Paper text:
[name] ([name]) is an adaptor protein that is important in breast cancer cell migration and proliferation. [name] mediates interactions between autophosphorylated receptor tyrosine kinase (RTK) and downstream signalling molecules. [name] primarily interacts with its upstream signalling partners through its Src homology 2 ([name]) domain, leading to [name] tyrosine phosphorylation and signal transduction. It has therefore been hypothesised that inhibiting the [name]-[name] domain would inhibit breast cancer cell migration as well as other [name]-[name]-related signal transduction pathways.
Therefore, the Phe9 and Pro10 that had previously been removed to rigidify the scaffold were re-added to the peptide. Therefore, to assess the mode of binding of G7-B8 to [name]-[name], the structure of the [name]-[name]/G7-B8 complex was determined to a 2.55 Å resolution using X-ray crystallography. Interestingly, the complex crystallised with four protein molecules in the asymmetric unit, of which only two [name]-[name] domains were formed in complex with the peptide. The mode of G7-B8’s interaction with the [name]-[name] domain was strikingly similar to that previously observed for G7-18NATE, as would be expected for this peptide that differs by only two amino acids. Asn7 formed hydrogen bond interactions with the [name]-[name] domain Leu481, which is understood to underlie the [name]-[name] domain specificity for the “YXN” motif. Only amino acids 1 and 8 differed in their positioning relative to G7-18NATE due to their substitution with Lys and Glu residues in G7-B8 for the formation of the lactam ring. This linkage can be seen clearly within the G7-B8 electron density and reveals that it serves well to support the adopted conformation for the interaction with [name]-[name], underlying its enhanced binding affinity. Notably, G7-B8, which is most similar in sequence to G7-18NATE, was found to possess the highest affinity of the three, with a KD of 0.86 µM. The G7-B8 peptide, however, bound in the expected orientation, making the same contacts with the surface of the [name]-[name] domain as first observed for G7-18NATE. It can thus be concluded that the lactam linkage, unlike the more hydrophobic olefin staple, did not outcompete Phe9-Pro10 to form surface contacts with the [name]-[name] domain.
Residue numbers in the entry:
A (entry chain L): 1 to 10
B (entry chain A): 425 to 462, 465 to 528
C (entry chain B): 429 to 460, 464 to 528
Amino acid sequence: KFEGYDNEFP
Amino acid sequence: IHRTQLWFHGRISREESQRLIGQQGLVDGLFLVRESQRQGFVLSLCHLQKVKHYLILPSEEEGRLYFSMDDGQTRFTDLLQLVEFHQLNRGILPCLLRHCCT
Amino acid sequence: QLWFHGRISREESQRLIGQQGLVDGLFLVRESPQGFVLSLCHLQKVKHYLILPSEEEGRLYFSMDDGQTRFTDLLQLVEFHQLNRGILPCLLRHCCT
């Protein structure tokens, strides 16, 4: 995750 | 490069991006790209009447610079390639980019 | 597009890629009736990947994995696979003209 963003990847 | 595309909005805040998407009707797939305020970019996308934000960061591999939303696992030479790829392929997104927020 | 070779057979492509030295990453694109073939050299061996068109929700696309990864045209497929391996054993590094 990128904290504060919605990115969701391994 | 990306400054010639109407979906690019430059240095606008997060709250401004949600207001713009609200202005255009909160349709699923409505999206825009904006510059980070603190060389990164943020893709703002509407899905199920909610506005999510996806960080885009640059890196360089042996002289060539690329952009990625998953820390290098999926790479793009520029933002246009990132955008059109995600009009056909979901990738890490919950929906396709279907409508431009001008 | 200099990487595209039109109606060239499977054997002719290997001779051309061979003539240019079997370099790692050397590739070309050729027609297979509505399909295309990406010919790519890796470890001095030439592999061939079928590219097929499909149509969903009105839009036509190309794919090498039956819909898992889609492209509007062959140029987009080529540019994507110059930075991401995908199903390929190496990146597209050098064009066969």
